[PDB]
Amino acid sequence: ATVNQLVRKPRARKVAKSNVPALEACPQKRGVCTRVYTTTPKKPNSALRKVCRVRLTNGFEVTSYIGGEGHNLQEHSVILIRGGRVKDLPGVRYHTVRGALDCSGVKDRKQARSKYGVKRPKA
Amino acid sequence: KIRTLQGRVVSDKMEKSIVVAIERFVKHPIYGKFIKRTTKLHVHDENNECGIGDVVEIRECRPLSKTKSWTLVRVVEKAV
Amino acid sequence: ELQEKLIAVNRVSKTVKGGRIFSFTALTVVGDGNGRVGFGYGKAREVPAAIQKAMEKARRNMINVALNNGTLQHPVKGVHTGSRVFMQPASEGTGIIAGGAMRAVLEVAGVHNVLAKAYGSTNPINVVRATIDGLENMNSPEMVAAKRGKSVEEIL
Amino acid sequence: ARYLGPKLKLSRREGTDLFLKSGVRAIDTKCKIEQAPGQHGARKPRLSDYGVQLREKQKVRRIYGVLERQFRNYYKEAARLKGNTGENLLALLEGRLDNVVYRMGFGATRAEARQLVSHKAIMVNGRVVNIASYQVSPNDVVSIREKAKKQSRVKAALELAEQREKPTWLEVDAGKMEGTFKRKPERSDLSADINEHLIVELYSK
Amino acid sequence: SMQDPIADMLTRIRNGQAANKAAVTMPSSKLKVAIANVLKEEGFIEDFKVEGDTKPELELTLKYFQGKAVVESIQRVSRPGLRIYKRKDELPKVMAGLGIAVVSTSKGVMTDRAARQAGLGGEIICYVA
Amino acid sequence: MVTIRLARHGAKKRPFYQVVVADSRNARNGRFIERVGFFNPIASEKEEGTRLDLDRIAHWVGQGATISDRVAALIKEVNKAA
RNA sequence: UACCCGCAGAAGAAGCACCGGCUAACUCCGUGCCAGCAGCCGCGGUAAUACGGAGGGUGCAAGCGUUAAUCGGAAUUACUGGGCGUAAAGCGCACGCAGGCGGUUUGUUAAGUCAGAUGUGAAAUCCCCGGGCUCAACCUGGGAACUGCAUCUGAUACUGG
RNA sequence: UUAGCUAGUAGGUGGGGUAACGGCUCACCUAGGCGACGAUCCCUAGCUGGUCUGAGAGGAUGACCAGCCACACUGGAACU
Ligand SMILES: [Mg+2]
Ligand SMILES: [Mg+2]
Ligand SMILES: [Mg+2]
Ligand SMILES: [Mg+2]
Ligand SMILES: [Mg+2]
Ligand SMILES: [Mg+2]
Ligand SMILES: [Mg+2]
Ligand SMILES: [Mg+2]
Ligand SMILES: [Mg+2]
Ligand SMILES: [Mg+2]
Ligand SMILES: [Mg+2]
Ligand SMILES: [Mg+2]
Ligand SMILES: [Mg+2]
Ligand SMILES: [Mg+2]
Ligand SMILES: [Mg+2]
Ligand SMILES: [Mg+2]
Ligand SMILES: [Mg+2]
Ligand SMILES: [Mg+2]
Ligand SMILES: [Mg+2]
Ligand SMILES: [Mg+2]
Ligand SMILES: [Mg+2]
Ligand SMILES: [Mg+2]
Ligand SMILES: [Mg+2]
Ligand SMILES: [Mg+2]
């Protein structure tokens, strides 16, 4: 804390790592679905979380949560991830964009429709 | 009137050339402390007339050599 | 008259043989729209009883603050136990730029133009004590003139 | 870029009158001005400090009909200009052309004054001005042009302006359907229920 | 070691006030005298006095108003580890002008207000408030 | 060679020309030596649309600077108004 | 082309997110640790203001949200502006080179320092006072500023020599 | 968790060379030179006016506009 000590060895900052390294400072990355499956969550919760193992374009192979009810996802399906982790899943750091390039919008969803890629239901 | 500087003589082993430690006294840009900073210059001397530990006064001239562009004007504190 | 603000309510506990006993705490501050400010801390099994005990203790133990027109007189600091607090006199109509409990205590203090900042722990009890101590030891040009034995104009 | 819905819903939310209608019929007749809108309108919840700062800023916006980005830029300008920020903010809201038209009583509401501006019925210093947010400098004349001078709603608005209190900082000539923005108004000339410090504290996080 | 007498002077004042001491003595100096000259003129101490010839002892008569101390706060600014020099525009206002900043200028030791009226800055010794 | 010329610094469809002294190999709006005024072709009444430091212009011409055709027009219009 | 004049008639022109707390804004019906939400705390096991729909409301608005990224908040690398008995943190102790600091008095120096002047610090940009496009955005005149460096002239309290 | 680097290297004399000083080059002589105030090595990187943020100090950054540098398939070379 002595000013001489700070002259000789300055105040170093904290290089903050990114919790989405596969995006490589991109907002979305195109991937290809390798394996679509379910996962049981942590102990306080209990479900079957829909999650896909994806080979990306940059070369990484990461898993990604599939939001919403229902999905037409298969293997060899071309999706677009966007970043954002599921807390109640170990190792899932990404969300699939519903309504992008193979993924369909949520069936018969009428609220929050843009977070799931659903057109406006005409009356 | 000409701009000139002073400093101790560090080495004198090479002929017609001495090395001079000019010790400027600057403030730190952040912490405000005044820190001595040392500048070494290769100085041309005719006659090899200076010694180690000697104070000298130098001016800037045309480049004599690769690393040498300074020539003394006079000597203060010649002896040990 | 004396405007009254509760800052925060809190539910506390006390474990006994039967189990947990819950209670409620209330932190209230009163003021006259001028330098007369005072705080209270009441506690009861029920929230309206706690605010009433707090307003009762706050109406007494008031403290007097030498204000300026509507602001402070010099940049003052106040501490209590977790809360270093800086506050600064400001220009007219810049508002109360203050955090949480300090806004309420200065509003009933009748101040209207401050630039404040609460460092450290922001527990409302200690930060309201730290503001009360800062305003209390803030001194006027008259008090410093009588103290140094000079005029106000010799002090400028 | 305008609010086009129900207006008394806004006055009911703010709890007071905003003069959003002409004041011919009484507002307590046209609406339950003491009850908030909606299913859960009867309940009055314990409103937070952010709530009162928001409701005050949405009051002033819903009075003058200014959207948020523009009201933010008025805050930026009022903080830049010298003196009291809240007073300069109200002086900028009162310098709007559609307010000057309302205060001169050429339109019954501020929206109708806005429509007269947008529909090319106002000459400023002889020159036609189509913009609602045109700032009106002191010592400026502002007139109804010739063709819309014969409108019914204009002299009906002058009747209601005679029912309303006359502002000091103006000087209107109801025969010529013109006026004169003499000076910027003082804070004392305006309403006293507007707590402008809540807005300054809102945009001063 | 005694690296700094001026902070020893200020500390003996500060502890004298907190101890309700009437007078405070210390080894004198030309600078400690010029500072006690300033503190008497500005009204914080009653009187100073230097006695002795070979090693002079400076005695300060402290000042108490309404029981409590006059000197509410006194702080060292420039220190041997870190000197502080300011220009005449960047001179500080202690307590918004209520306190003073003892400044050493080429024309002697004065307060910050007289340094501004003199149009010249120098070394900030202490904040007295 | 060194020349004296205009430099388009305006909005679209509403130009405004800084009359500058520049080495002619540089760009139009680029590097210059000395700005010796301006010209506004969309100048309203009761505003200046032409202001030229004619002392500096005669200084650079004494140094051998050339004059553009419009600058020499604006020097004519100044020396005819004045 | 701007711009202006004329015609007809409210016609040709509003959506997005959110409503457990933080965080402005609530009720109902499905639903049953399922389906699913999620920034954090956390919701969901038959009466879910937290899921999904509806009604209502709130915030923005030709945009609204999400994601990525930077600063801020964070006094959470603390120069301003932090700490080290027990919360992370005093080397096991010591001598000691370089280095940092240095009692008191007089004289000198003027390096630091302070003041002033000169040159420079491109323009633009930021800021101030104005001007011009129906306003604004924008454009623009003038100024301040660029906290710096160099030289010279002084000052001598402090520090250094 | 890079501590030693350097023989045209460092300097000198003379000759050559360039628009020009100069190891720029050559011969000879001398044995130096840099480095803990970080040499050398490694990774990364065009620089600035400025931009964003911030009460400020600071932090991050260098798209557009303007100033300098560098390159023009890659590696080299010279001519005019
Ligand atoms: Mg804490
Ligand atoms: Mg818009
Ligand atoms: Mg202002
Ligand atoms: Mg709420
Ligand atoms: Mg239910
Ligand atoms: Mg929620
Ligand atoms: Mg941070
Ligand atoms: Mg920080
Ligand atoms: Mg700490
Ligand atoms: Mg332990
Ligand atoms: Mg420990
Ligand atoms: Mg120990
Ligand atoms: Mg000493
Ligand atoms: Mg000097
Ligand atoms: Mg100077
Ligand atoms: Mg500039
Ligand atoms: Mg204008
Ligand atoms: Mg001395
Ligand atoms: Mg001296
Ligand atoms: Mg030769
Ligand atoms: Mg040669
Ligand atoms: Mg590169
Ligand atoms: Mg900060
Ligand atoms: Mg090539």
PDB file of N, CA, C and O (backbone and C1' of nucleotides) and ligand atoms in Angstrom, chain G residues 131-132 135-136, ligand 17:
ATOM      1  P     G G 131     -29.046  33.715 -32.396  1.00  0.00           P
ATOM      2  O5'   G G 131     -28.437  33.384 -33.823  1.00  0.00           O
ATOM      3  C5'   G G 131     -28.030  34.443 -34.668  1.00  0.00           C
ATOM      4  C4'   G G 131     -27.409  33.949 -35.945  1.00  0.00           C
ATOM      5  C3'   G G 131     -28.240  33.008 -36.791  1.00  0.00           C
ATOM      6  O3'   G G 131     -29.244  33.645 -37.556  1.00  0.00           O
ATOM      7  C1'   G G 131     -26.089  32.139 -36.582  1.00  0.00           C
ATOM      8  P     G G 132     -30.668  32.935 -37.765  1.00  0.00           P
ATOM      9  O5'   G G 132     -30.406  31.841 -38.886  1.00  0.00           O
ATOM     10  C5'   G G 132     -29.879  32.215 -40.141  1.00  0.00           C
ATOM     11  C4'   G G 132     -29.440  31.020 -40.943  1.00  0.00           C
ATOM     12  C3'   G G 132     -30.496  29.988 -41.268  1.00  0.00           C
ATOM     13  O3'   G G 132     -31.327  30.348 -42.348  1.00  0.00           O
ATOM     14  C1'   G G 132     -28.559  28.911 -40.511  1.00  0.00           C
ATOM     15  P     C G 135     -35.819  25.919 -38.983  1.00  0.00           P
ATOM     16  O5'   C G 135     -35.964  25.091 -37.650  1.00  0.00           O
ATOM     17  C5'   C G 135     -36.412  25.735 -36.484  1.00  0.00           C
ATOM     18  C4'   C G 135     -36.810  24.745 -35.426  1.00  0.00           C
ATOM     19  C3'   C G 135     -35.696  23.833 -34.975  1.00  0.00           C
ATOM     20  O3'   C G 135     -34.854  24.449 -34.035  1.00  0.00           O
ATOM     21  C1'   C G 135     -37.674  22.594 -35.278  1.00  0.00           C
ATOM     22  P     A G 136     -33.280  24.231 -34.129  1.00  0.00           P
ATOM     23  O5'   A G 136     -33.154  22.707 -33.757  1.00  0.00           O
ATOM     24  C5'   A G 136     -33.484  22.298 -32.456  1.00  0.00           C
ATOM     25  C4'   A G 136     -33.637  20.807 -32.380  1.00  0.00           C
ATOM     26  C3'   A G 136     -32.429  20.023 -32.838  1.00  0.00           C
ATOM     27  O3'   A G 136     -31.481  19.856 -31.816  1.00  0.00           O
ATOM     28  C1'   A G 136     -34.351  19.157 -33.867  1.00  0.00           C
TER      29        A G 136
HETATM   30 MG    MG I  17     -31.964  28.619 -34.541  1.00  0.00          MG
END
